[PDB]
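pls ignore typos typing on phone
chloride ion + seq
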Amino acid sequence: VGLTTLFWLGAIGMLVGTLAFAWAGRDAGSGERRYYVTLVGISGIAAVAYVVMALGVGWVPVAERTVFAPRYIDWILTTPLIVYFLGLLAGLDSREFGIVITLNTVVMLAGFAGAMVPGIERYALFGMGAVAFLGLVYYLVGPMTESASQRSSGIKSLYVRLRNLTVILWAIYPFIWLLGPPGVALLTPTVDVALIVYLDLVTKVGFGFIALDAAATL
Ligand SMILES: *C/C=C(C)/C=C/C=C(C)/C=C/C1=C(C)CCCC1(C)C
Ligand SMILES: [Cl-]
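k done
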């Protein structure tokens, strides 16, 4: 199994999620539609990014490594949508959304920038992202959880389930980044991509399926 193959697998998984979310939201009352649309965009954008990488585009040479630019474009656009989904579920107002969305953006921008910087100073960008990430986790586990507590028992339960999925799985990315080509380059590009393809699929499609389950049960 090579990079190309791993990218195709990611494209296929994202496509399956995209189609399922689009279908399940066919009707969608008039206030629940928002959730389905966000899911379609999250997995849809990732699907495109993976096909692009699978076709060999965006493989940017940096120092003695390769940076998959599409992955980062994908993250920068999709992770804020995931955060939006959680904030909607938690019942946040504009100001609340604004804070978590910017922290999220700082994480992804710093990571992309760090990956694109050849020198050892790139770790300074990585650190910036790590710090903003802790801020994001704080909001997810604190204020946003407090806000969610004002919703029905089911919604609060779905929020908690997805919050846990997000906090735990997202916290893993920085380590894979630090151990792979972007950092120490211990893990080969293939192993790093394999691990990240799984993580992307679960944080997006796994995330979506869990939500659909809750919606159905509700
Ligand atoms: C669908 C894609 C997802 C859910 C991607 C998530 C990515 C992260 C949580 C990345 C985090 C990073 C840090 C916390 C430190 C700086 C470097 C990053 C970008 C790998
Ligand atoms: Cl990369």
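The first strand starts at residue 59 and ends at 62. The chain has one domain: 1-218. more later
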